[PDB]
PDB file of C-alpha atoms and ligand atoms in Angstrom:
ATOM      1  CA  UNK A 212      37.266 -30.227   0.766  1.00 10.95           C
ATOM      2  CA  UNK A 213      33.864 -29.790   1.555  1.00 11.25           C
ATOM      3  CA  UNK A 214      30.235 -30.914   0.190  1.00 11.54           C
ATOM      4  CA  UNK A 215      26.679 -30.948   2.421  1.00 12.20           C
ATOM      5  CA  UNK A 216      24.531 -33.153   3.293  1.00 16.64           C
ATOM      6  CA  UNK A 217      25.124 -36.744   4.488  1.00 17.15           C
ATOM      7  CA  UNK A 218      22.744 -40.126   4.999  1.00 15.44           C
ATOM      8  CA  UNK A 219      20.543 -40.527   7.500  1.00 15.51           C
ATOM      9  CA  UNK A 220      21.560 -43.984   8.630  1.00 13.91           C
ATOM     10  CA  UNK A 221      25.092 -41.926   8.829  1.00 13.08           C
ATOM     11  CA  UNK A 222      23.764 -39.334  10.650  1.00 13.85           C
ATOM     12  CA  UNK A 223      22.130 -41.621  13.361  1.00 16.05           C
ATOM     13  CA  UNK A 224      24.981 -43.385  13.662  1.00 15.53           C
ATOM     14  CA  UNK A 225      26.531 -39.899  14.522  1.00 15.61           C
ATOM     15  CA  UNK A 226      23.598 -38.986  16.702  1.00 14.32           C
ATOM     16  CA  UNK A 227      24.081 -42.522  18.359  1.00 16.08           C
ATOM     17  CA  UNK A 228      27.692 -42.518  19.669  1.00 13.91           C
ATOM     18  CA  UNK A 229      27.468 -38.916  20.477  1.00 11.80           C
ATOM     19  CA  UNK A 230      24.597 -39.986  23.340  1.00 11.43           C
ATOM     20  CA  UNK A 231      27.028 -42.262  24.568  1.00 14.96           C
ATOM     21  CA  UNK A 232      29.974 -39.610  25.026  1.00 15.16           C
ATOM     22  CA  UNK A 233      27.437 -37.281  26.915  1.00 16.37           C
ATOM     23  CA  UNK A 234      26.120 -39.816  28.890  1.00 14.37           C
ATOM     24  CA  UNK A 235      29.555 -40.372  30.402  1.00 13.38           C
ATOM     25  CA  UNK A 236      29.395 -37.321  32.126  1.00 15.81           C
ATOM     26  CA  UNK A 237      26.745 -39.025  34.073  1.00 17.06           C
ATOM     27  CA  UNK A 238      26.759 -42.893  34.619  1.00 16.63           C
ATOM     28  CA  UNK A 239      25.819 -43.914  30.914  1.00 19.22           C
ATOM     29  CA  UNK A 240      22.320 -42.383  30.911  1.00 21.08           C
ATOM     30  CA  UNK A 241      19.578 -43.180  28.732  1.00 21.15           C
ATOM     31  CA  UNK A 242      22.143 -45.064  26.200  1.00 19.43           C
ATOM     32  CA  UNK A 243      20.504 -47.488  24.076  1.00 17.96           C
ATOM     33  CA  UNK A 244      19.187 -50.660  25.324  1.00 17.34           C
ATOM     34  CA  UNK A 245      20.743 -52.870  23.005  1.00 17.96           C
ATOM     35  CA  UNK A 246      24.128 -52.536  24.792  1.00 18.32           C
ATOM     36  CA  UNK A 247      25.393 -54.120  27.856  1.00 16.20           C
ATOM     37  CA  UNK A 248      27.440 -51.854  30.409  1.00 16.33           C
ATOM     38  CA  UNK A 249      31.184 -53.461  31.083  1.00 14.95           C
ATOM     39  CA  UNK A 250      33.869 -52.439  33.368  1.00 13.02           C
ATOM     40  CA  UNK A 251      34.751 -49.142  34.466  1.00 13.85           C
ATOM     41  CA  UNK A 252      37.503 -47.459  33.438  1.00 12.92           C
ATOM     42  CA  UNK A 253      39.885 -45.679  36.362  1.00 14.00           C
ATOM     43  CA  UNK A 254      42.852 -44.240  37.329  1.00 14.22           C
ATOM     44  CA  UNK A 255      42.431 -41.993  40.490  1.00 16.13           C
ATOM     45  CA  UNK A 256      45.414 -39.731  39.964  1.00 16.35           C
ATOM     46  CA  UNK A 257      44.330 -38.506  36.569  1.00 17.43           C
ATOM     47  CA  UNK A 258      41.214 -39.029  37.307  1.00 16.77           C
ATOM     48  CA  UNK A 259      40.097 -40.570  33.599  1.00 14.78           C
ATOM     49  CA  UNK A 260      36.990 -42.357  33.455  1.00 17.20           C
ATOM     50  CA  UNK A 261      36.094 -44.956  30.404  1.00 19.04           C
ATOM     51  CA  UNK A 262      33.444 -48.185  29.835  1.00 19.96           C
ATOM     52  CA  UNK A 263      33.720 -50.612  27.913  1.00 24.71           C
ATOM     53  CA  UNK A 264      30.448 -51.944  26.014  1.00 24.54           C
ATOM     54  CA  UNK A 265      28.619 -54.860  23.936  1.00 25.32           C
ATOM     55  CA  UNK A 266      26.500 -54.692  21.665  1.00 22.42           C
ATOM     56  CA  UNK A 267      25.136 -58.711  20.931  1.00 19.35           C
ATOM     57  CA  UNK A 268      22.755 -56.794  18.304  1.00 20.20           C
ATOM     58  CA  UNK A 269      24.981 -54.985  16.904  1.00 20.50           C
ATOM     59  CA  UNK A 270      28.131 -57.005  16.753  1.00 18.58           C
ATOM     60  CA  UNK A 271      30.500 -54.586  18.234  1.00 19.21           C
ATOM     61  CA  UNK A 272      32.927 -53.573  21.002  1.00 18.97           C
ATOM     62  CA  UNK A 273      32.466 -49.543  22.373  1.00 20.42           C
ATOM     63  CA  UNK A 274      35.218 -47.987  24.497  1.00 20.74           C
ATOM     64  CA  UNK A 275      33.624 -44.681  25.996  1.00 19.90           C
ATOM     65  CA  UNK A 276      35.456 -41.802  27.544  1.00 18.27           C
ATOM     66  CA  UNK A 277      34.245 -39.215  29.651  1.00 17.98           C
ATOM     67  CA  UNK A 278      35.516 -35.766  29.078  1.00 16.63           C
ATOM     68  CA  UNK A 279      37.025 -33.146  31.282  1.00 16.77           C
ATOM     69  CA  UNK A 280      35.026 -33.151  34.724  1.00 17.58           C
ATOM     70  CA  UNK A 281      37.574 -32.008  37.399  1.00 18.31           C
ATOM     71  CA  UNK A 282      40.275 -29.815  38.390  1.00 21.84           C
ATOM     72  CA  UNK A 283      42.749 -32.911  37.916  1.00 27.35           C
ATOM     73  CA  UNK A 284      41.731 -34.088  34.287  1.00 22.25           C
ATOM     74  CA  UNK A 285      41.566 -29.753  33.459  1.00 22.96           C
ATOM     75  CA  UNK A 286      45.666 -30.282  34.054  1.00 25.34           C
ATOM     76  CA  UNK A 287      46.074 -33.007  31.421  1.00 23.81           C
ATOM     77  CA  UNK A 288      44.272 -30.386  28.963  1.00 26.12           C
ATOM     78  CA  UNK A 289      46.468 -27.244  29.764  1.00 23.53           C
ATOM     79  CA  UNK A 290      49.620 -29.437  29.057  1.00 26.69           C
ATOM     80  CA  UNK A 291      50.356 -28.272  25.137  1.00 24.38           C
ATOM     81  CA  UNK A 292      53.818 -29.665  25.092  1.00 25.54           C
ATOM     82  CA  UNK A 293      54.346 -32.076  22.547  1.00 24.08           C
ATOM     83  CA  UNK A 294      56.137 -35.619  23.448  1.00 22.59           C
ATOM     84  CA  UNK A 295      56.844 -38.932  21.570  1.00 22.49           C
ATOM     85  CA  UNK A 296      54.296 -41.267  21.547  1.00 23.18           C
ATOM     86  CA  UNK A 297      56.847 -43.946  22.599  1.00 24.05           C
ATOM     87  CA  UNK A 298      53.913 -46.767  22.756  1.00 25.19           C
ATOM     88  CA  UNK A 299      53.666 -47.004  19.224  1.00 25.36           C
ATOM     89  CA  UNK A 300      57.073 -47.358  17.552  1.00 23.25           C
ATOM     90  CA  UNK A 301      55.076 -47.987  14.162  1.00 22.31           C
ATOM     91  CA  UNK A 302      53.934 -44.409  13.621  1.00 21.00           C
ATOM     92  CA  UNK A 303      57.233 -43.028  12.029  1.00 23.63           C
ATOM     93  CA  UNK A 304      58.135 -40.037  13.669  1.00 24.14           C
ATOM     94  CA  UNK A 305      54.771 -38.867  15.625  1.00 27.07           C
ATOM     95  CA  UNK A 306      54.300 -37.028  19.066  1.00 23.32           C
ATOM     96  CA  UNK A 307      51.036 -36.536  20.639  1.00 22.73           C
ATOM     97  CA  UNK A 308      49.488 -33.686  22.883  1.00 21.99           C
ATOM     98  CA  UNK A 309      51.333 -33.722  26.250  1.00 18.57           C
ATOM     99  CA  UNK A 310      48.965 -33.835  28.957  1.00 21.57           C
ATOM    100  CA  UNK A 311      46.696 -36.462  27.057  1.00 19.03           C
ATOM    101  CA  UNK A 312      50.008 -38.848  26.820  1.00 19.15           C
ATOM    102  CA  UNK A 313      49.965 -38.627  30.311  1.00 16.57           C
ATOM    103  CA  UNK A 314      46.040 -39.763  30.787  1.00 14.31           C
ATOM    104  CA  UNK A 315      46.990 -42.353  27.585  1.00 14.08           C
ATOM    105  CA  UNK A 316      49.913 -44.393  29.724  1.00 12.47           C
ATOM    106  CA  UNK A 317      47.400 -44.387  32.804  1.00 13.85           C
ATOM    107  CA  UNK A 318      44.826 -46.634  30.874  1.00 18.54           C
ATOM    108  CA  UNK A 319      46.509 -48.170  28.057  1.00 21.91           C
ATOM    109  CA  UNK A 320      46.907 -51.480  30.661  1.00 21.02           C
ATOM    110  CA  UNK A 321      43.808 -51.204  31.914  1.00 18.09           C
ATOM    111  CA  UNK A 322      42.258 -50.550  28.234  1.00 19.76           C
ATOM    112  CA  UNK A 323      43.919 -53.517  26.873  1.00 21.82           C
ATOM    113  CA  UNK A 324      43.205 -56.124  29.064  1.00 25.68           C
ATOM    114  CA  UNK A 325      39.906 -54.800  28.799  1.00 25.30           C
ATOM    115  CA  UNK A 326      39.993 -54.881  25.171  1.00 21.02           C
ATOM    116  CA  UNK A 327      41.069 -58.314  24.749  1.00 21.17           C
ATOM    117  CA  UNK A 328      39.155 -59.805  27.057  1.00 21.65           C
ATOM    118  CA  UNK A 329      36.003 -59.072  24.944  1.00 22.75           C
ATOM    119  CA  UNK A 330      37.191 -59.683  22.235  1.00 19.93           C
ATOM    120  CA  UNK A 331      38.903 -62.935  22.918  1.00 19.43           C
ATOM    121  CA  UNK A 332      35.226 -63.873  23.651  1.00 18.21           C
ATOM    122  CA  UNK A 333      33.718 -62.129  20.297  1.00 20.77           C
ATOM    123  CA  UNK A 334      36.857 -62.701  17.867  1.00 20.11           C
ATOM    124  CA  UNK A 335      33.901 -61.339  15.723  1.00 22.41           C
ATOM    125  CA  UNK A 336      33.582 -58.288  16.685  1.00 22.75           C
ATOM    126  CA  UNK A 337      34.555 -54.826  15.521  1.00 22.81           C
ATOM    127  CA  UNK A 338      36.185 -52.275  17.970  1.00 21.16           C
ATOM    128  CA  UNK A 339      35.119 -48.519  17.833  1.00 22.80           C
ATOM    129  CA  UNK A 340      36.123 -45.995  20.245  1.00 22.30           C
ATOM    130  CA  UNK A 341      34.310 -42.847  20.953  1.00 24.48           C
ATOM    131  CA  UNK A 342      34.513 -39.772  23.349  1.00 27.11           C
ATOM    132  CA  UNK A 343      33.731 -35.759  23.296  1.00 28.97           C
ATOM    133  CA  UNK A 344      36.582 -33.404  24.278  1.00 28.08           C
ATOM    134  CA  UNK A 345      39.358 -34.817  26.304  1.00 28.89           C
ATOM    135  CA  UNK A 346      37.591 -37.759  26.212  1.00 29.66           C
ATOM    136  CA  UNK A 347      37.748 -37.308  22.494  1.00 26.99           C
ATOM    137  CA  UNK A 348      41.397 -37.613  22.255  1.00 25.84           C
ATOM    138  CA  UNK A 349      41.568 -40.214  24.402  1.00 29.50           C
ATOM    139  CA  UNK A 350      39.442 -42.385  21.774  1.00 29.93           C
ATOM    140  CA  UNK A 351      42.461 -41.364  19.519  1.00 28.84           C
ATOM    141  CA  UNK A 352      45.308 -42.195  21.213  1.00 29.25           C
ATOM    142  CA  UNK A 353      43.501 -45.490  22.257  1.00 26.92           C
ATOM    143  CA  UNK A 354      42.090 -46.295  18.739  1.00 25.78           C
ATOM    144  CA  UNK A 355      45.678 -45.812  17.289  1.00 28.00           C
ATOM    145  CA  UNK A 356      47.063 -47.617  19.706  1.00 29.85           C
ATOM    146  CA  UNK A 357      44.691 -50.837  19.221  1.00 30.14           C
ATOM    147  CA  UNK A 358      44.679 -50.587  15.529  1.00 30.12           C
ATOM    148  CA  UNK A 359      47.677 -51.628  15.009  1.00 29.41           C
ATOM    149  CA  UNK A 360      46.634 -55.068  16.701  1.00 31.70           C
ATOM    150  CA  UNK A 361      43.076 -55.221  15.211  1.00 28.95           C
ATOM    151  CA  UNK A 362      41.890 -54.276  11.941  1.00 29.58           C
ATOM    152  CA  UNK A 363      38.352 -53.560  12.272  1.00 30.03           C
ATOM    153  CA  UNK A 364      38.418 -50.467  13.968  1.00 29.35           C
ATOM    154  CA  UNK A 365      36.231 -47.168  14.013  1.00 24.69           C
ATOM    155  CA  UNK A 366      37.036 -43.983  15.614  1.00 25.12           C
ATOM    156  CA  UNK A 367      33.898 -41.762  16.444  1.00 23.17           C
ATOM    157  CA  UNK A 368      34.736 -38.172  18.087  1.00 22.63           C
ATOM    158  CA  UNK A 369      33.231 -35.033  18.981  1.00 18.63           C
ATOM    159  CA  UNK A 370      34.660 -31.776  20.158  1.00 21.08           C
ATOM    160  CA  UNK A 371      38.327 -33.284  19.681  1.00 19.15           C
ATOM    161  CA  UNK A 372      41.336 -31.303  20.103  1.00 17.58           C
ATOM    162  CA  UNK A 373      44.241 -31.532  18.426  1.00 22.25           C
ATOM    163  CA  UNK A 374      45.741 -34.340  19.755  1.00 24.99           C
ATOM    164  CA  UNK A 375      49.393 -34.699  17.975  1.00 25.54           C
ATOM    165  CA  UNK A 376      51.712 -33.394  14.713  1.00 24.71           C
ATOM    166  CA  UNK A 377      51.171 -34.238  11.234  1.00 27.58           C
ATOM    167  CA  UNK A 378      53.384 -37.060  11.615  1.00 29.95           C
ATOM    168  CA  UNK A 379      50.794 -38.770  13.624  1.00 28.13           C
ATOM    169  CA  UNK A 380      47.922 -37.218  11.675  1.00 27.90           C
ATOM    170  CA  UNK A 381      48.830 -39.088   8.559  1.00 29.36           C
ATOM    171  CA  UNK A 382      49.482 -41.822  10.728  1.00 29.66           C
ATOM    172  CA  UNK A 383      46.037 -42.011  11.607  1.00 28.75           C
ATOM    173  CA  UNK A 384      44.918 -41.208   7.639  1.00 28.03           C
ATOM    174  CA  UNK A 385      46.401 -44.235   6.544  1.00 32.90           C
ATOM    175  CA  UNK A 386      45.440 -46.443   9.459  1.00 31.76           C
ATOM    176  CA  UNK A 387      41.970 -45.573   8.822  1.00 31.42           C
ATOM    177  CA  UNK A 388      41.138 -45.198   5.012  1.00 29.95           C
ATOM    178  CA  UNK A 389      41.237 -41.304   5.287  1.00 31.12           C
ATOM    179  CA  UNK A 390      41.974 -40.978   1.476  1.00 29.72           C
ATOM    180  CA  UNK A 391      38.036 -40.736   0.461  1.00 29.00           C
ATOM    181  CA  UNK A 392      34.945 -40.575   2.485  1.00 27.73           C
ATOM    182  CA  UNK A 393      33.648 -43.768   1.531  1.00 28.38           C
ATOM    183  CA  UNK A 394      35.779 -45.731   3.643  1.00 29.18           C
ATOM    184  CA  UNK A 395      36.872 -43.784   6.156  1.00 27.86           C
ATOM    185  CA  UNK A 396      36.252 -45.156   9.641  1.00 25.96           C
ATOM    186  CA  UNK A 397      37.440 -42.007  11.530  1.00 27.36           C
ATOM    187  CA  UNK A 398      35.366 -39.785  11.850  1.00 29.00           C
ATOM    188  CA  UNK A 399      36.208 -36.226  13.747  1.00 30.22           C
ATOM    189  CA  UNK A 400      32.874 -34.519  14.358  1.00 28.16           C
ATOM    190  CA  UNK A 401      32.810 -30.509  14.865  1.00 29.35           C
ATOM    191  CA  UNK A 402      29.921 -28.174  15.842  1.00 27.94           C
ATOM    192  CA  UNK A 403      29.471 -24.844  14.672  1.00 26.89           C
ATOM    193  CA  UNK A 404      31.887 -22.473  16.399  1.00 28.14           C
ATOM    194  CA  UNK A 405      33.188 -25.229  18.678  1.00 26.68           C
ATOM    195  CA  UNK A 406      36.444 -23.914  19.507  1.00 23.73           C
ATOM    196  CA  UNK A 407      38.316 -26.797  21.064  1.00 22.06           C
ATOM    197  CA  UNK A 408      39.496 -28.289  18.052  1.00 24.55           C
ATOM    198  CA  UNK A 409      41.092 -25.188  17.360  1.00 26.83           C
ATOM    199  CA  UNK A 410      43.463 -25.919  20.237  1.00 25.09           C
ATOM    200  CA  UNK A 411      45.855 -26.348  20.696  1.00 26.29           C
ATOM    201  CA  UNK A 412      47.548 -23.588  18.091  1.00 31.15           C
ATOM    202  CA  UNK A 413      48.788 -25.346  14.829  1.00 34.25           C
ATOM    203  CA  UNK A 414      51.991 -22.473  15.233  1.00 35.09           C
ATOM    204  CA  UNK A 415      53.443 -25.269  17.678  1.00 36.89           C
ATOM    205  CA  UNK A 416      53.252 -28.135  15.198  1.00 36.92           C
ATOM    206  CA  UNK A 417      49.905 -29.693  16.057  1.00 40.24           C
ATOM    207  CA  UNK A 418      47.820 -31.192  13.290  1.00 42.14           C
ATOM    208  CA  UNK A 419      43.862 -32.660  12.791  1.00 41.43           C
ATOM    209  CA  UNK A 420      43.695 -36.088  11.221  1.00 40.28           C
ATOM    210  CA  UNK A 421      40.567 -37.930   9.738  1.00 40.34           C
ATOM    211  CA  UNK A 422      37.430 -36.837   7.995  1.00 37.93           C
ATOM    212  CA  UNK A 423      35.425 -33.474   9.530  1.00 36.83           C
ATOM    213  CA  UNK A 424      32.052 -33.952  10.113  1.00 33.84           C
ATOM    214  CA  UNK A 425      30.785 -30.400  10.222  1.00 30.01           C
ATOM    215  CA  UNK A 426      27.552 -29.670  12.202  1.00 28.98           C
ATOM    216  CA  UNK A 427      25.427 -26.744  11.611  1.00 28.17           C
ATOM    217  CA  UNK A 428      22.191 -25.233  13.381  1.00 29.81           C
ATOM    218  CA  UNK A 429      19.617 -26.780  13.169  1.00 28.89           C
ATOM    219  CA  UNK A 430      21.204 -30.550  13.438  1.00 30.33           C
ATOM    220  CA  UNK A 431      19.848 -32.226  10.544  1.00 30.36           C
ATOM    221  CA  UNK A 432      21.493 -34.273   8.544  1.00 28.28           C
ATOM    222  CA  UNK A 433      20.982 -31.941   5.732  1.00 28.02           C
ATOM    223  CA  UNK A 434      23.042 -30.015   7.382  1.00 26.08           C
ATOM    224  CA  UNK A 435      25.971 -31.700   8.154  1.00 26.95           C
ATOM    225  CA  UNK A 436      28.865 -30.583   5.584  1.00 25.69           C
ATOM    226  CA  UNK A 437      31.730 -33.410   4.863  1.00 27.07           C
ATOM    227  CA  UNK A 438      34.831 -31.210   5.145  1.00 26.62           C
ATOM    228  CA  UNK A 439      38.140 -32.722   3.841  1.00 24.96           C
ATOM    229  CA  UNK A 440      41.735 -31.835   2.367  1.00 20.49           C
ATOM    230  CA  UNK A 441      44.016 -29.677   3.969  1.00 20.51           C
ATOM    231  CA  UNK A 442      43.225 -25.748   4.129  1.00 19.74           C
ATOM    232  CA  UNK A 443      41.096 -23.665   6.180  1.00 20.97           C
ATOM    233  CA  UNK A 444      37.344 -24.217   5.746  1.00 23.12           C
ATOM    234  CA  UNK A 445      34.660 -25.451   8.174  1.00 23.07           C
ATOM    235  CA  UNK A 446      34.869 -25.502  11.987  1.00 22.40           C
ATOM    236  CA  UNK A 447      38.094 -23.780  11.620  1.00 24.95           C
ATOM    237  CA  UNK A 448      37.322 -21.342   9.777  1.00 26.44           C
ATOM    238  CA  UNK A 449      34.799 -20.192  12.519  1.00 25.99           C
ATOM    239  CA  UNK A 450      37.527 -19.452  14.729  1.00 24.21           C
ATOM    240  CA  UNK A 451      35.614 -20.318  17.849  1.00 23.41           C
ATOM    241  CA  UNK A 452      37.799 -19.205  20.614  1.00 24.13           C
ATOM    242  CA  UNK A 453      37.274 -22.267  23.687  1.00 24.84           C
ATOM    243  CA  UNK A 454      35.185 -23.482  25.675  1.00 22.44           C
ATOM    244  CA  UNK A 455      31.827 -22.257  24.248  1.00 21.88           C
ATOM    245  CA  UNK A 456      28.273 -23.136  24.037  1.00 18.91           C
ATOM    246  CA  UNK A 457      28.433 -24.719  20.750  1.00 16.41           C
ATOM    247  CA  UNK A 458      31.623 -27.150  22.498  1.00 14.56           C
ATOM    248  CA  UNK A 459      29.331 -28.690  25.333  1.00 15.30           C
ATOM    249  CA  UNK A 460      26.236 -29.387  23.011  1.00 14.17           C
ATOM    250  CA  UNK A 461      26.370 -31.679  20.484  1.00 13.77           C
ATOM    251  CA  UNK A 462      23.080 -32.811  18.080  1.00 11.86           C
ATOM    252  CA  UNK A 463      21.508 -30.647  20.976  1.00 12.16           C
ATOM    253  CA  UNK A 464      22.448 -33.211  23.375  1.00  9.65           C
ATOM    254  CA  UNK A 465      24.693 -30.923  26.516  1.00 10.70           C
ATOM    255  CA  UNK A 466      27.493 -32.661  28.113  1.00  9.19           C
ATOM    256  CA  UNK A 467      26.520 -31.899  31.731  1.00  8.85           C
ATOM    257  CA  UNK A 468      23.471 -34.646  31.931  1.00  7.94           C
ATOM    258  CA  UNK A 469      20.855 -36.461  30.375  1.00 11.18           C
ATOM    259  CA  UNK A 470      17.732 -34.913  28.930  1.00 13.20           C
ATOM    260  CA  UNK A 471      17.898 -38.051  25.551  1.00 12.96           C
TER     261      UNK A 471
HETATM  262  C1  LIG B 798      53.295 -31.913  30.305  1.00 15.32           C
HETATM  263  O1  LIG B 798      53.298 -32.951  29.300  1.00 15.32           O
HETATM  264  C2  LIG B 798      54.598 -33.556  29.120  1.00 15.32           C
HETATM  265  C3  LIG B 798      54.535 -34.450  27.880  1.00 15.32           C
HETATM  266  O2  LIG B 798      53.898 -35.695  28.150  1.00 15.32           O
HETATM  267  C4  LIG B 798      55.007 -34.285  30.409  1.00 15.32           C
HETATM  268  O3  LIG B 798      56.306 -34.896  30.240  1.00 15.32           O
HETATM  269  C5  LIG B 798      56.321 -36.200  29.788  1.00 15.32           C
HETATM  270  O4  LIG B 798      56.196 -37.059  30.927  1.00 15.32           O
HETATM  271  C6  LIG B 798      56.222 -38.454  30.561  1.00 15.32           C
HETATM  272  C7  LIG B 798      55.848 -39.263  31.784  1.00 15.32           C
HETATM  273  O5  LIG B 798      54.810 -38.631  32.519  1.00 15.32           O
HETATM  274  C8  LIG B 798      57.602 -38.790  30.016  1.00 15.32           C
HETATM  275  O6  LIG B 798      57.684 -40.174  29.708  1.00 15.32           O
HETATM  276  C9  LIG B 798      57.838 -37.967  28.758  1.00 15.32           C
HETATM  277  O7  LIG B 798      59.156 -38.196  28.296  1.00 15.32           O
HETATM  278  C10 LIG B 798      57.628 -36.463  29.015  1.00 15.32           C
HETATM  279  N1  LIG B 798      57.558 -35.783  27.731  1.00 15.32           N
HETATM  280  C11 LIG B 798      58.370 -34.767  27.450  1.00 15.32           C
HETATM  281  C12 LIG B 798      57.807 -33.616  26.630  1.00 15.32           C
HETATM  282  O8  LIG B 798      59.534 -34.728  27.824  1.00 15.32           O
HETATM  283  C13 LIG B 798      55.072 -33.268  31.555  1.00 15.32           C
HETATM  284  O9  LIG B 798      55.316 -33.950  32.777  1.00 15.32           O
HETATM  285  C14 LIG B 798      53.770 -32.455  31.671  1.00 15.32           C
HETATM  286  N2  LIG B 798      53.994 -31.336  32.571  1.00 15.32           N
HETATM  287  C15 LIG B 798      53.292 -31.218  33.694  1.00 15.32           C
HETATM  288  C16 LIG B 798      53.531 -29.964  34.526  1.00 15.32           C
HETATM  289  O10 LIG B 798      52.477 -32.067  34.075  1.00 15.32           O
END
């Protein structure tokens, strides 16, 4: 359930998709060079806001969504009522957070044709999703979603709720090699205190999936503890409250703007 200390090329990688979740916030910042900026990703009355990325050095296909960054996307998080997520018959018996199911069905279209249409192109290709906060979850419920089409896909989040039960957390385990750390390709990334994956409360049914990435200060690799199992350890044993300093910043990188 819990050892310290990770690679480095691990912990860049880490370092590397969580400059791409901040840099949402803005308009994709100072994100490496290597990648080529897509289509944006909209829906005005939800207000969620996505890319969609290349990487022709890398060999891959990154969805990124922003997080929470008005009044309208602060009503999907609120929403803790629980709901089935009907778009994915194949995940026996799971129901995901409510207000993110709403943001979920206002992209998935959008998402997929977006998806595809790189893909199509790149057959080649791997598929990774990333995001910090809401935009966290909505990595999840995206990356579950287009897993079960695709195969090579990697989930990278940061600051992630908890978006669904435990029928859809082991849903997600399976899906993406959860049962060791070696070949896991989800990986849920926490910060000290962070208390926003602590909501919503677990007395309601809600449940984390994949592999915790815990983050101490200072950064470092060194200090990065590889938290698994089920009990309380970690991030959650913290008991950050919400919305906190340690939530916003992430490998000292702050969600508000560029500064990497
Ligand atoms: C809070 O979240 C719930 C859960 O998603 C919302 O109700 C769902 O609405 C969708 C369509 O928007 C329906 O397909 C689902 O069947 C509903 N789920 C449930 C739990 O019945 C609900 O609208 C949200 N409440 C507010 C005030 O926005």
């Amino acid at each position: 359930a819990s050892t310290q200390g990770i690679s480095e090329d691990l912990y860049n990688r880490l370092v590397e998709m969580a400059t791409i979740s901040q840099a949402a916030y803005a308009d994709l910042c100072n994100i490496p060079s290597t990648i080529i900026k897509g289509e944006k990703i909209y829906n005005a009355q939800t207000d969620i806001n996505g890319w969609i990325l290349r990487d022709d050095t890398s060999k891959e296909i990154i969805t990124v969504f922003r997080g929470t960054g008005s009044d309208t996307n602060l009503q999907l998080d609120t929403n803790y009522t629980l709901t089935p997520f009907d778009t994915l018959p194949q995940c026996n018996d799971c129901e995901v957070h409510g207000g993110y199911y709403i943001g979920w069905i206002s992209v998935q279209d959008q998402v997929e044709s977006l998806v595809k249409q790189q893909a199509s192109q790149y057959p080649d290709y791997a598929l990774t999703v990333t995001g910090h906060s809401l935009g966290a979850s909505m990595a999840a419920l995206t990356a579950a979603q287009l897993s079960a089409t695709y195969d090579n896909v990697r989930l990278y989040t940061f600051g992630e709720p908890r978006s669904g039960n435990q029928a859809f957390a082991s849903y997600m385990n399976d899906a993406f090699q959860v049962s060791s750390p070696e070949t896991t390709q989800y990986f849920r990334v926490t910060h000290s205190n962070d208390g926003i994956p602590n909501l919503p409360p677990a007395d309601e049914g809600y449940a984390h999936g994949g592999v915790e990435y815990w983050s101490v200060d200072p950064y470092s690799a060194q200090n990065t503890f590889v938290c698994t199992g089920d009990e309380v350890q970690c991030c959650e044993a913290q008991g950050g409250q919400g919305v906190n300093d340690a939530h916003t910043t992430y490998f000292g990188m702050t969600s508000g703007a560029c500064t990497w």
